Every structure is written in structure tokens, then in C-alpha cells.
Amino acid sequence: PQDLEFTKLPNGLVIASLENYSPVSRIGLFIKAGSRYEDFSNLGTTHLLRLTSSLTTKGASSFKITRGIEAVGGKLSVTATRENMAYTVECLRGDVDILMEFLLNVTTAPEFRRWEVADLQPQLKIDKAVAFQNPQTHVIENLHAAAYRNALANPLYCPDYRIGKVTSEELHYFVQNHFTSARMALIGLGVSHPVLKQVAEQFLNMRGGLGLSGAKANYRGGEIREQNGDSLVHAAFVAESAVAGSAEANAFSVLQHVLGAGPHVKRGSNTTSHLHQAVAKATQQPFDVSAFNASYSDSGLFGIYTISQATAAGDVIKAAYNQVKTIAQGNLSNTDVQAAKNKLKAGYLMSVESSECFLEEVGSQALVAGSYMPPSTVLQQIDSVANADIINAAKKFVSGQKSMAASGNLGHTPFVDEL
Template structure:
């Protein structure tokens, strides 16, 4: 360790091997009020409940007055990649990057200044696109004006859209550095024919080809009041209603019809020169917000959804315990679960060296088979439900997580379920429910997944999705 002159004060810490603290220890307990302070004169603030309302134009308004000095507002739009067509593939990727383009007479530089001051962001998924921003409570009017302008009055000038090509290429290059992203994106392409099969990233053949006209057309079809939710934290409900009835009324309408994504199943293999084999074996899961989806979530925790503590190994999960008995070589395994408005995916995701991939995959799916055959106890189910509830409650501790949960529910159902209601739904999951959904998922365990002997022509159920990203030197 290099110790410089500025570090002289801490050398004694290493010599004496005693703990050093930044401040002297206080004698008074932290539970006791500090002496000499005047008592607060302001009346205690009354906790407020979430308010949700739907305007005649179809716009959903949701708010929670949490009496915070900071306000957070988000515009949630049903404009995810699933709403792309064959003609405008990649438009949502470009639209996500175009949030700082010219809004009528406002320049990108001025928008960037506002973005920095208001701490705003744009995120997108397969279901929705979210424009969110934070500000001091006194700046709420500027924040709302900014969000409305970004979502309703962008010009998409052709030369500015063309300049986004470089950023699209950078996004794709960064995504290619993470095999997990490629696995999940390819999984959806194998599982669905359209809609949910669309990638979050612009396909190669459309890079630089998404036009200003396509952006305008997509926004006209999807950014309508009946497909939007205006959500706020630390802001009065009446203020959001006024914005929805006024500025956002120009986007009234139902928008383009929504086509349901039909699950089909399939198999895809991507060959490369890596030493590791990524395999994701999945089947159709539960629809978002249903009791079946809750059972799949509990099953995911039973099998293993990764470590729950910092630098944890997750060795207590069924997947890791089962695979560790089958091979002594390094591996990683986790249960995969994704729920959407009309479908879902559930399966097991393994990473292993090429010469042990077959053993790892077979051991992983054997754990799913074991649950389907009733190989779990009430204690397993109770422990998994506690993990689900803890993770859900911790996600609501931050304003970002609470805004996302409030907006997702408002956009999907035009209502809000309190955390108590969500916890009751999780508690209602029984051992039989978990066995039933694992039996449905059991389609993925009815074949031997030996990487050296599994031919492309193998007969399997259409409800299976088999995805391998493996070394090019293996013949199939």
C-alpha cells in the first residue's frame, strides 16, 4: 500500500491495529435527542394515500403526496419495442436516444441544460417507454412543462436523427460485450414470432435507416392519452390532473390497435469462439399480475435467483446444490422469469465450460423435474415467499422504485394495489401452486440436453425454447 504525506494521520492505525473513526465517540446514545435544540414548531404531516384517476381522454393520473422536498414525475407510455412493425424495427431504440433533440424552438443545448438541472432519464422495455425526472418542489411547473414537451412536441429533424446513428452503434457494441443481454434478446426471438420477439436494440440492417418520418408515425400511433399514465411523487394530484386535462389533451385518441404476442417456442444456437457455453432453456410463464405469475416468482426463488447479499455465492439454492453434485468444474446457474401483459417466460439459465456444459444443463433441469414431482417442502415455499416479499418491499424504499411500481400498475390496470395487497397475494401462493407451475415448466426437462449428441432434428414439444450460445468447434 502506498502511503503519502497526506496519509500520515492514519499510519498509527496500521501500527496499532486499532479501529480509527472519523469522529470522537459520543457518550450520549443516538436514541436521545441532542441537548440545546429547540423543539419543532411545525405540525406533523399526515401521511397520504396513493390517488389514481382516469380522465375522459383515457389518460391515467396517479400520485402520492409524500411531503418530500423533492418531486418526481414520470410519463409512462405503452410504446415499447413490442409495438414495432417489420417496417420500423429499431424505432424505439432511436426514439430513446432522441429525447434531447429539438422541441420546436428549443435547442438541444438548452434541453441538455434542463436535463442536468432536473435529473431526467428515458428508459424503455418491451412493454413501455418511461420519461422521468426529479426536481425541487418549487420547480415542479418547469418539470411538467419539460416532460410534456419531450413527449408531445419533438420535431425529429432528419439531420439530427441521422447523427444518432453513432450512438446507436455504441449502444449495440456495449450490449454485445455482455453475453447475458444477447441471451435474453435471442430468447425472445425464439419464443415469439412478433411483438415480444422485437429486440430492445436496433437490428443491424436498420442501423442508420430509421427515418424522421418513421419516428413521427410511431409517436402518432402510440403516444396517445389512452396509452399513457402521468405519475408523480411529492406533487398534488390536482396539479397532475390540470396538466393531463390541458397540455396532454392534444394527444387524445386510442392509438394503433395492439396485437397479442403468441408464444410459439423454438430453438436457436449462436456459435462463437468463447470458452463458455451460455444455455437458456425456457417455456411459457405467467401473465403479469396473475396468481400464476406469483407462483412462478416463488418457484424462481426456490430454484435460485442469484445471491441476496453483497458478494454472496448463492450456494444455498436448489440449482447450485444440484449442479455442484454433478460436476466439480466452475459454473453459474439461475432461474429466469419474465412476465408481460399477455405472456411470460420461465426457465433456467446456465453458464459453464464447454466440456461440462451438458452435465450442468442436465443437472439444472433435473432440479425443475424434482419440484414438478413434489420434491419441495413447506419450509422451502415459505422461505421463497419471504424472499419475494422482502425484495418487493426493498424495491419501494427508493423514489425511483416507487415511481416505477406506481407507474407500471397505473399504465397496466388504471389502478394501484397497496403493498399490503401485494404481500397478501404472495402469501396466498401454496405448495400445490408451485408444483402446478413447475409441471407446466416440466416440458423443458423431457429431453436429454447433451451438447455433444443433441441434434437439430430432435423432436420436442412446441412449448420449449432451447437457446445455446456455444463454442464454434462443436458439431451438432
Template sequence: MRGIRSLNNLSKRCYAAARPNEALTESDTGYKSSGVSLPAPQNVQVSKLPNGLVIASLENYSPLSTVGVFVKAGSRYESVENQGVAHVLRLAANLTTKGVSAFKLCRGVEALGANLSAALSRETMVYTARCFRDYLDNILEYLVNVTMAQEFRPWEVCDLTSRVIANKDRAKRAPQCTFGMSLFRFLHSGVIEKLHEAAYKNTLSNSLYCPEHMVGKVSPQQLHSFVEDHFTTGRMAVVGLGVKHSDLTELSKRFLSVRVGAGAPLVQATYRGGELRVQNQDSQVHALVVSEGGVAGGTEATAFAVLQKILGVEPHVKRGTGITSKLSQGVTKASAFNASYSDSGLFGVYTISQANVARDAIRVAIAQVGSVAEGTVTEDDITRAKIQAKVDYLLSTESSDGLMAEIGAQALETAAYRPPEAVLQAIDAVTQEHVVKAARKFMDGKKTMAACGHLINTPFLDEL
């Protein structure tokens, strides 16, 4: 019987009748066009309301609508007194609000077949809702509740402690692919956090995760205060995919204009340079050496992006070795590091090596950047790097999540959107002079170093 039942699972294609021996073409005489034309492609539309709320949308005629609320409320906006509040706030996205209970929020979103999530970076908090476009009004009700009507009941906030601890531990153990490089798969997030802690005096030095001394100590009052200061219309952008701009504007006016104002002012990041080392028994040493890079969206940041491709990122061929990159030619498991923010940036080299050769690996990696700074880079190297930079950018916006992040970041920062054509033109405009200048800025700039592992043979910053 078991064998007989298994036959029912066979595809009908296995025993379909053969087509009679006749012509495969048929006359279209008598057929009439339905008269339905495909909708014209739309461009991203951006508008700004008088209350400061920025609205951006792209009508792509998808049956699914995605709406994201971007808020300037990342970890960089924490103070010394409320460190870790952004991490706890992200985990609190599914708690009871003034409009719905945690149970109703969960059941209601599931009943719509929707998805509601929260994500945190150093600069932004992003709440994203995805559903069938017919249920957009319904899902926005829940989205508004978790962004503008938080309640933070003390017992629910207290219950988040175990999740904060588990989230930190999981982040330390999980593979890290933040920079799109397969060689980072064993990199602990701790070395990135240490790098920012050493590099900056304020704001960007704050960790994405709640520090140990604040676990279980972030109070509902601190959460309320943080939301009141930062979740205002002047610090928010609403981005929609698969939704009409007029509809999104109307819904935003109705639901998201509750807390009007500019909110807390932005504190400029102050780069200082420095060094932090984490000694443990790992056989491999992870080391990052950086200088201050370019501000996101600027010409200098584009030059650093091209320089990063010249020095090397992950191989572009499966199981490839990245032999065209400068760093892979000089050091095994080395790559360029590039992070840009609204008012600062970091650029440098990242190496993974055995403890006994860590000193040589770091020095050779820095020497490769020095070689570019001396003008040894060729036009072929720059052309290849530009192609890789353009392809990576286009691939990053190919998915709805990547496109949403790109539109949201630009709308939140500039209240406008630069189309892909303009970005590609900016990459094409990078010259050899720009690349050499960027490499020199790294070589001449004040360095920051973070290292993790068995550091017996890892040089200190003043020894490089």
C-alpha cells in the same frame, strides 16, 4: 507550506473544547411546542381522465418531485417495416422539439438543477423528470416537449446513427443485472434477445436494440408515424412522487392532453417455442431453456415468482453461495429465469458452464425443476421462498425509481394501484400445489432455448 495548508482540512471536531463537568440533562421548563405537526402519510392516488389519460401520484413530502410519463410504446409495438424505431426514439429524447431547441433543452434542464431521462423496455417507453418541487411547472414544460412535441429534424436523426451503434456495442459488453443476479454479470444481452426471438412469432420477439440492417435507416417519417400511433392519452400514464394529486392532474390536463385517442391496438403475443444458437469462441456457455410462464399480475405469475426463489436466484448474503436453492445444489452457476409481460411470460433455467460440461449442466438444471414438479418441495422450502419473494419486492420499491416503475406499470396496465400489503398477501396465498403446478407447466410446456458460446458440447433442444 503544503503541510500547513493540509491542516486547514482537518475536521474541527479534532480540536473542539471539552464539555465542562456538569449534568448532561437540562430542564425543559419554559420551552413551548411549536405547534407544527408532521403531515399525515398519504396513499397512492389514481384517477383516469375522460380522454383516457391515467394519473397516479404519491405525496411523500419530499423536497424533490419526480414525474414520469409511461407510454405503451416499447419495442413490441414495432412492425417489420420500422424495426428499431423505439431504440432510436429513446436516443432522440434530447433532440430539438417544436417548442425548444436541443441546446435550450440541455441548458434549461441544467439551470433548474433537474434531471431528464428516457428508458425503454419491451412494453413501455418512460420519460422521467426530477427536480425541486418549486420548479415542477418549469420541468414539465420540457417533459411535455420531448413526449408530445417531437420534431425529428433529418440531420439530427442522421447524427443518431453513431449513438445507436455505440449503444448496441456497450450493451453487449456491459455487465447485465437485469434479473438481479450476480451470476449474470458476464451475460451478454444478445442471449436474452435471441431467447425472445426464438420464443415468439411476433411483438415480444422484437429486440430492444435496432437490428443491424436498420441502423441508419430509421427515418424521421417513421419516427413521426410511430409517435402519432402510440403517444396518445389512451396509452399513457403520468406518475408523480412528491407532488399533490390535484396539482399533477391540473398540469396533465394542461400539457398532456394534446393527442387524444386510444392509439394503435395491442397485438397479442404468440408463443411458439424454438431454438437459436450463437457460436463464438467464449470459453463459457450461457444457456437458457424456458417454457411459457405467467402473465404479469396474475396468480400464476406469483406462483412462478415463488418457484424462482425455490430454484434459486443470487445469494442473499454477500459472497454467499446460495446453498438453500435447488439449482445451486445441482449445478454450479445456475439460476431460475422469470420474465412476465402483459399477455405472456417466460420461465425456465439459466446456466453458465465450461463448454465441455454444458450438456450435463443443462440437463441437471432441468432435472431440478422436474424434481419440484414431482412434489419433492417441502413446506420449509416454500416458506423460505415466500420470505425471499416478499423481501425482494419490498426492496425493489424502496427507492424512488423502483417505486415509480411499480406504480407506473400498474397504472398503465390496470388504471389502478395494488398496495404492497395486497402483493404480500398474494405471495402468502401461494401453496405447495401452486408451486408444483407451475413446475409441471415448465416441464410439460413447449420449450425455447437460446445458447451462446463455444457450443461443441451443448445439446440441441430436441436432445433435452
């Protein structure tokens, strides 16, 4: 029946703890860095950085780090988005001290030696290739590239022309301007609060202050079309949406679940979705449709993602688009909204159920203000979404300037100006 403790230190570092009884402890360091802070001169730096988590440090060599973590049996991982980065370690309660020391060294004492960086470059290409096997990866990065001018467009993977051209100087420059105390948050689960304070005191004698800041992500209604020999076309067309934290963001979340954000029944037909039940009666069964919602600090994106056949690519899109228009025209019943809300609550509480996702959630909202937001309050806000708000969101999407990113045969896919 324990609760969490929060403290904000003079430097700016945020600490968090939630004493549990699981025999496994997990600690995470969340940094407000990402690809949104790079520029055209240093593109591809973050991708290389997230692969350097096992390089030699001032206080520990690469050999020591790898062997030590393996002998203890713990795990080290790095998770990166376009706005945040996170280091995470998991181990047993009795070995927490050593792993915290390694995490201190890696995030605080990086060397970035020349020959090591040169060797890592091959890895980058392999890492980018395995991720691009899934077509959605390429499609969505192009979508960002076709939706913004300056920020939130920088790819999450190193461009091919920058491989082998990343230097230790860029790594050091990025670390010193972004890995700052007032930009970090340390979260612990199996550890007690006072020991976190102790290790934090070791974190409060480095870096410090604030860091270089980026610029507002301007919106450009672009299109990027790619041609290949695949039999299936992946298309995504999107419009701007206000984000984050506003009740309008909640309205968009409810809206996407009205339109069938995802599947519930294994091998089901998704009879409760307005999109799948329109495409199904329009063309053959092989297809897929869903709503797409992305939230970022200064902007948000809401749209529709579809996978269909090359010949049927056109009609499919039309049908999906039509469905949204009916919602914006005032056609709605207060019985699917309740179902949509239930879907949202279930997804949230069931996603946070795992300890790993719970740690990620706490770290994510610890940076905006540091005040934890219990799920009960989240549910309260969700239940407060009216009906006119959802219609308002639909009208904004229809009237908004659209973007698009298609990848496939694109022989019958429509252009953005024909939608």
C-alpha cells in the same frame, strides 16, 4: 402520513400524486409503447426514439432543453422495455414548473428534423455495442427471437441492417399512432395534485383517442445457437407460462425463488438453493445457475439460465433439468416454501424502498387498471399460494414445448431435442 390521489380524466389520461416531504420531486410519464408495436418494416424505431429525448421541439430548441435542465441541476432519463416506455425527470421542488414544461414539449412537440436524425444514427451503433459487451444482453434477445413468431420477439436494439435507414416519417408515424392520451399515465411524487391537473389539462388538448394495437405474441419452440471463441458458454432454455396477474404467475415467482433466483450472502455458496447444490457436486466450482421468469401482458416465460465451462456445459444442464423434475414428481417439503415466500416478500418491499423504484412500480400498474395495489395486499396474495399450485407449475414447465438460446464454444452443449 399522507396518501395518494388518483383521477381518470375524460380523455383517458391517468393522473397520480403522493405528497411527500422529501426536498426533491420526481415526475414520470409512462407510455404503453415499446418494441412489441413495431413491425418488420419499421424495426429499430423505438431504439432511435429513446435517444431523441434532447432534440429540438416546437416550443423549445435542443440548446434550451439541455442548458435549462443543467442549470437547474435536474436529470432527464428514458427507460424502455418491450411493452412500455417511460420518461422521468428529477429536480428540486422550486424548479418543477420549468421541467414539466420541457417534458410537455419533448413528448408532445417533437420535430424530428432530418439532419438531426442523420447525426444521431452513429450514436445507435455505439449504444448497441456497449450493451452487447455483457453477454447476457445478446443471449436473451436471441431467446425472445427463438420463443415467438410475431410479438415479444422484436429486438430492443436496432438491427445492424437498419442503421442509417430510419427516417423522420417513421418516427412521426409511430408517435401519432401510439403516443395517445388514453395510453399514457402521469405520476408525481413531490408535486401536489392540483398542479398535476393543470399540466394535464395541457396534455388533454393533444393527440387523443386510442392508438393502433398489436397482435397476440404467438409461441414458437425455436432454438438459436451462436458460436464464438469465449471459454464460457451461456445457455438458457425456457417454456411457456401463463401470465399475468393470475395466481399461477405468483406460483412461478415462488418456484424460481425455491430454485435460487439470486444470491443473498456476499461470497456465499447458496446452500438453500436446489440448483446450485446439484451443479456444485456434479462438476467443478466455476459455474452459475438460476431460474428465469419473465411476465408479459399476453404471455410469460419460465426457464433456467446457466453459465458454465465448455467441457462441462452438457452435464450442468442435465443436473439442473433433473432437479425440476423431482419437484414435478411431488417431492417437496413445507419448510423451503416458507423460506421462499420470505425471500419474495423481502425482495419486493426492499425493491420498492427506493423512491425511484416506487415511482416505476406505480406507473407500471397504473396502466392495467389504474387502481393502486398496496404492498399489504400483495403480501396477502403471496401468502395464499398453495403447494399443489407450485407442483402444477412444475408439471406444466416439464410438459411444455421448450426453446433455447446458447452462446459460446457450443462444442458439448446439447440440442433442444436431446433435453
